[PDB]
């Protein structure tokens, strides 16, 4: 297929061939914006290369940015960039230590029931109409509760909070309700932060406040806690949506794979893994070299940005065999990059996995013969996170 | 004595330490016993600092502006600007847009508004014999100008300054930040359909934040925050920092009293001696050699503007003292090069005004040096309290 | 349940967790939430652990033997051997010399001395109905043999064990370490002109420490320390660990009571089921692939000897239970390959003796499983207290 | 001159030409023991290369050993190796943090008087005999007091402690008094450690005990504190001796340089720096690569040991000019490697510097026209630390 090109809503449907293209012919692809040559960068597509890069945080930095956009830490450009910039060990270690305290196994169990309740409520509402938009009806609002949960947002506010969430996530002058939501969200948290100073819980934010972040005047601290929550509200929400929605077409395309999980629900957890591999909600993130580095026969100059195609890595035939491109709920894939590897390995991987499990389990139980109108599926914009905005669902069984 | 990052108790007199460095260790090496890897260098001579600032490709700003490699560690104590600028080409565009909010029309337009406040507050002080000139005037003063450049509508200036003064400060500032944050979100929204001439309007007009951006809208708020705090302290610093200087040299003030036509030139001298931004670091993007010393690539190098301005090698023997008639050239109070301060004009205007009115309405005033209280912070040197007395 | 490094409260029954791993996650990946970089793998199947241990060039020992990358951080809590062995070629020479202190003559020579103590203490216990068989016998017992291999003269064995028992334990052990340290320095000095057949004599005879070496003399002391502690706990572990097993399966004991000619074979079975050294890590020297999983170079990989020995894929369905008649082959209680235990013989002898005398003089004994107390430590599993009762 | 070859007492006199040889012709010299080829290693001699290597602790590890001896962390071989093995950041960071607490400026001031007292006592005793062995009479016992000081050894024990010190430092069956000293030293410290558990000072050791090292049973901890003290007693003692003694011939060879410091004692501190550069007590230490690394046109395989010739680096003409080999007390040398650079930059650099200053100052004041019988100077064994055992001194002025 075509050569590298950052993804758009139009290209998100089948980026797989471009990946194969790169993997089979330009493992270390050099991109040179024809107009702005000073912003050239590289793209890694082979599982092996992407894997090493992600892990070797010493050579491939994060604190410079996570996208191929050099103006990332400035003002112009942004739009498609994480709200917060992550540091590298040792600097990053304090943070990871503290925030991981709000990301324990109890955190998952404590909110799983809520997840299932909602999943079942919406699933049955859809069985009522014998169809609908499973993304709009379930996979979009679903993650918001988990994110609110991890952020330490009290139930009374859940209603209000989800409001703001949905206004912002919708961003991509309809986005005016967005600037508004952000402000609202903004003030809310400075409040919640205040509340936590003396009424701490065990949510990530409580552990940062309790640890002193944004304490006695420390403005920069408070600001970063905010940057964190907004990064969670935005990304933590639609990465899960991307997984759930993105899984629909994969399953639809193969009822035999669906049948396996039907006669034996035990395969679901493993299936979630295979689904995670193929969907790769976070298709790719970039790094900045901290010294001239040589991969294969290409030598990426220091200071250059390199995009790690996690999505291509999870589909690399070299790592997963000939059928890498196909769905195999029994595959039990090892070394997937869906959550990356190394210092920043996703803290909510078990939260996402739980959500996928509950969702897929309930779905397969109540809508054993669902169908997806692929052709009518809509993909969100952005070049890094691959999620669907709309997924025409329809249980070939009603009432 | 040996070099060391300043503190509120060491800010009263860093001058000797600077001389020491300029004279005996131009390219000073600091090696923290606890962390020899988190080592850095300190340039103190005017010629070097000047050349360093001008050479952005070699001395980058995109790594931080502090000598602390672990600055971005949420741990605590963040003596650092609420956000950091990139270097060209990246910075070029940003700077180009924001500079449209820093035009001559911009500075001129608010001057009258500023002079009025200065006079009102000065007279309020004469009506009391004295008072703390920093909290009473110098602190609130720079607040207005920031708002003016951020495009904050006048009616709000009262409510706004309300937060400003809480943030630049029992942490009710958290609330102040939330309020101000949300405030700006609306102002940005608004600016999408009412593009004035403020920096923010020019940014929003470019597409920043204008689209449920997030990140983009957050960087807008980071910038507004930098201005809100940095823009206050620096002016507060210079205006307050000038008090003891003018107090100590009555002969100088006399020159300005007999001939106020020399106040603009005095403003330069005062800026040279105050250097509110005593220093800011950079990070070598390659191994660079200065004199005998060679600084490895990726090393923080603190540019001591404050010292460079007092460098005898540049301003003569008396470089260390007040000479309102000096008319110093090439000062580094606003750095040099790609990051040269955009609010230099705005900064100068506030002092030309403030100083003129001070001298014109309180020709005879006294400052209790001994009772001045400096703020903390190793990079920006400003007084928290400067007891004033007109008589 | 999910995998996790053992603790004194989890040592009572790890068997289920192992099964789980062997059956569902042969090459288990552990990713610490606080430190995803300090991640590692856990091999639990006999075939893999066996192959891992045999392949030293790929799975090195010279990085540490714990899954904790920050093991050598003085911070605190050091669940790790008092020193670490290198891999061939380096290890080859060391092992060659030290192995001369682990000869057949060596094991045979002290057996009688050992059996006597066993009998004395066993009778002392019969004279009291019972007592704690670990503190009363199993703990002091392995002490003698170590001393014997370290070349500690018998008269001292009393004073020596004195320290041993203090160290293997209000930290009067610090003093015990100092005393023992100095003790060995003299013994080494001595050995320069009185080279016996102990391991130390063979080392000193080679030139180690013998020259105001330091380092060299300190490594001698590190080794003697490893032996002193490790060599005790492991045997203490196996002997004590066998108590509940023999207690639980009276039918088994009966087989040994009617025919004590089957005790040597029972010793193997008991070693297979106790695996005092439940596990020890290695560090991949290259990217290596096991099954679907690929472990990156420089990754700690915990070899679960304890699990490999209970692997049904190797010993059949009942692999999980006591069959003194089994005569298990290729157990991993003493690892395999370049680091295969040198004191395997010495270890086996102490149990052949201890067990025979136990069964011969207390055919009818009881162990209060419910009241056994395990020691801490995630790699060596031994009981601190095993209340004994003869009746 | 000849090709690389680890130093011996016989070769320590003038190793400078071998260095130049390497620098000018084999900057990345490959050494291959003819008999044990598996133990091949590399040697860096150019200031630039040695400097980068020392700093880049990520690539060039320390925790594997500090010498070119691969059996370093085992048993056979040792002899010429540090008693303790240093870790790499982050692991090493805790230690550095705690021990540096006992290495403050006060620590120097608090013991400087003692240094000067002793220096003057011995100097005058030598003026008495109008000569003697300045190493045996002063530069050998001198450092012991500072080391005892930093280790937190109470004055009453000073007598006893120095005894053991001298017995061990003498190591290189006369070394029998050594094995004895070590044992004595050994037990002493376990005691001192005990004492510190409740009677802590501000000496390095107190900070480790107070921090918990070797606490509630932690045997490994206690053992490492010991390894540290023995590393100080051995190395901390004779590196200073190497500097002081080694400086004698350098000064002797140039009375004009000595004259400068005579008419202006201010130059002494700077002189100490130039002396430090030329003496390089720690001529070199090795590192182990943690990945294939390429210097120039040579690519040192990972896992290989590399010797960083600090002594050659300080003499590199490229860094210090044409006269790099000569003494210039006004040179004011920048970037010297005498104390290394990076994570392990010597903690006692200011202590050594103080000693050199006091010594050199007193010497130049009381023995302005001393002489050294170079030909009769004796060098200690070992390939890493270059110190003299004997230095025939003689003030061409008596009484
Ligand atoms: C299927 C959904 C998800 C995917 C694919 C995903 C993916 C990722 C990836 C790849 C990273 C690291 C990016 C890099 O630097 O390469 C990351 C980090 C992280 N994720 Fe997720 N994530 C998901 C859901 C979540 C959720 C629901 C939460 C929160 C409840 C979460 C919390 C975080 C946090 C806090 C980190 C930062 C860890 C660090 O920097 O050490 N993620 N995620
Ligand atoms: C006493 C008065 C002030 C002083 C001494 C001061 C000093 C500085 C310095 C040293 C820099 C460059 C720092 C570096 O990169 O090393 C700077 C940049 C800047 N200042 Fe100020 N400043 C003052 C007042 C103001 C005010 C009131 C504003 C406007 C509201 C302002 C806006 C800025 C901006 C936006 C830049 C960044 C320019 C760029 O990055 O291209 N400054 N200032
Ligand atoms: C219950 C009895 C014992 C058990 C289960 C045991 C277990 C082990 C294991 C697992 C190893 C290899 C560890 C590895 O590298 O992964 C080992 C090595 C060794 N053991 Fe033991 N051991 C026991 C008793 C003893 C005794 C009493 C001595 C002798 C006094 C001894 C001396 C050693 C030595 C010196 C080695 C190292 C060999 C080498 O590195 O080449 N062991 N032991
Ligand atoms: C002229 C004399 C001395 C020289 C040339 C010297 C040299 C060195 C060097 C080169 C290192 C680091 C080696 C490497 O890894 O490359 C070192 C580390 C150190 N030195 Fe010295 N040293 C001297 C005197 C002392 C003294 C007197 C003390 C103690 C009072 C001392 C305490 C230490 C300590 C504790 C470190 C370890 C720091 C760390 O690992 O972070 N040194 N020394
Ligand atoms: Cl603290 C933190 C920082 C970064 C990331 C990861 O980057 C997030 C994805 N994400 C978010 C949550 N879980 C996954 C991201 C990528 C690309 C773009 Cl354009 C936007 C976003 Cl939000 C995760 C936590
Ligand atoms: Cl966009 C921008 C970024 C940085 C700077 C300059 O850095 C500011 C000073 N400042 C602020 C305004 N005018 C001057 C600063 C330095 C040190 C410390 Cl601790 C705090 C602050 Cl705020 C200027 C604009
Ligand atoms: Cl020279 C040598 C080095 C290591 C080992 C083996 O490692 C020992 C076990 N051990 C000791 C003796 N026989 C067995 C050990 C493991 C874990 C923990 Cl936490 C402590 C210890 Cl002590 C054996 C000789
Ligand atoms: Cl904690 C620590 C570890 C290592 C070193 C440094 O290595 C020391 C030199 N030294 C010692 C003190 N100051 C300098 C050394 C090198 C070579 C040889 Cl053969 C022996 C020794 Cl002792 C310094 C502290
Ligand atoms: F798009
Ligand atoms: F660029
Ligand atoms: F890898
Ligand atoms: F139901
Ligand atoms: F139904
Ligand atoms: F302060
Ligand atoms: F001065
Ligand atoms: F000069
Ligand atoms: F840090
Ligand atoms: F323009
Ligand atoms: F307006
Ligand atoms: F001038
Ligand atoms: F005016
Ligand atoms: F005063
Ligand atoms: F435990
Ligand atoms: F089981
Ligand atoms: F299987
Ligand atoms: F660590
Ligand atoms: F042999
Ligand atoms: F004997
Ligand atoms: F078998
Ligand atoms: F027997
Ligand atoms: F029981
Ligand atoms: F020698
Ligand atoms: F080797
Ligand atoms: F360098
Ligand atoms: F005298
Ligand atoms: F005299």
Swiss-Prot record, chains A, D:
Its EC number is 1.14.-.-. This is Cytochrome P450 130. Inhibited by azole drugs. Keywords: Heme, Iron, Metal-binding, Monooxygenase, Oxidoreductase. GO terms for molecular function: cholest-4-en-3-one 26-monooxygenase activity; heme binding; iron ion binding; steroid hydroxylase activity. It comes from Mycobacterium tuberculosis (strain ATCC 25618 / H37Rv). It comes from the Bacteria. Substrate binds at residues 88, 92. GO terms for biological process: cholesterol catabolic process.
From Swiss-Prot, chains B, C:
Its cofactor is heme. Changing residue 230 to A: The binding mode of azoles and some arylamines are reverted from type II to type I because of hydrophobic and steric interactions with the alanine side chain. Keywords: Heme, Iron, Metal-binding, Monooxygenase, Oxidoreductase. Its EC number is 1.14.-.-. PROSITE patterns: CYTOCHROME_P450. The keyword Oxidoreductase applies. The keyword NAD does not apply. Inhibited by azole drugs. Substrate binds at residues 87, 91. One of its GO terms (cellular component) is peptidoglycan-based cell wall. Heme binds at residues 95, 230, 282, 305, 335, 339, 341. GO terms for molecular function: cholest-4-en-3-one 26-monooxygenase activity; heme binding; iron ion binding; steroid hydroxylase activity. GO terms for biological process: cholesterol catabolic process. Homodimer. Belongs to the cytochrome P450 family. This is Cytochrome P450 130. It comes from Mycobacterium tuberculosis (strain ATCC 25618 / H37Rv).
């Amino acid at each position: 297929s075509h050569e590298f090109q950052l993804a758009t809503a139009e290209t998100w449907p089948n980026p797989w061939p471009m990946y194969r293209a790169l993997r089979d012919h330009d493992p270390v692809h050099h991109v040179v914006p024809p107009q702005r040559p000073e912003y050239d960068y590289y793209v890694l597509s082979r599982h092996a290369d992407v894997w090493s890069a992600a892990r070797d945080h010493q050579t491939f930095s994060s604190a410079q940015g996570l996208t191929v956009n050099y103006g990332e830490l400035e003002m112009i450009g942004l739009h498609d960039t994480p709200p917060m910039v992550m540091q590298d060990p040792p600097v990053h270690t304090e943070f990871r230590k503290l925030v991981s305290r709000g990301f324990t196994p109890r955190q998952v169990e404590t909110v799983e029931p809520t997840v299932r309740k909602f999943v079942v409520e919406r699933l049955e509402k859809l069985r009522a109409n014998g169809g609908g938009d499973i993304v709009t009806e379930l996979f979009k609002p679903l993650p918001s509760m988990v994110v609110a949960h991890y952020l330490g947002v009290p139930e009374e506010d859940w209603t209000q909070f989800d409001g703001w969430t949905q206004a912002i996530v919708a961003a991509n002058g309809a986005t005016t309700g967005a600037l508004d939501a952000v402000g609202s969200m903004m003030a809310y948290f400075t409040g919640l932060i205040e509340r936590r100073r003396t009424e701490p819980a065990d949510d990530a934010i409580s552990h940062l406040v309790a640890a002193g972040v944004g304490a006695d005047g420390d403005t920069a601290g408070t600001l970063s806690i905010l940057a964190f929550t907004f990064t969670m509200v935005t990304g933590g929400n639609d990465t899960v949506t991307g997984m759930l929605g993105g899984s629909m077409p994969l399953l639809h395309r193969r009822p035999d794979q669906r049948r396996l999980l039907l006669d034996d629900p035990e395969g679901i957890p493993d299936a979630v893994e295979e689904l995670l591999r193929l969907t790769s909600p976070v298709q790719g993130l970039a790094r900045t070299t901290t010294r001239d580095v040589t991969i294969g026969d290409t030598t990426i100059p220091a200071g250059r940005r390199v995009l790690l195609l996690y999505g291509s890595a999870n589909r690399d035939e070299r790592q997963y065999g000939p059928d890498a491109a196909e769905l195999d709920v029994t595959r039990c894939p090892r070394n997937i990059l869906t959550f990356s590897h190394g210092a920043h390995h996703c803290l909510g991987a078990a939260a996402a996995r739980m959500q996928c499990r509950v969702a897929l389990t309930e779905l397969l139980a109540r809508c054993p013969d669902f169908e997806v109108a692929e052709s009518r599926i809509v993909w969100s914009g952005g070049s890094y996170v691959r999620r669907p905005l709309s997924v025409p669902f329809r249980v070939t069984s009603s009432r």
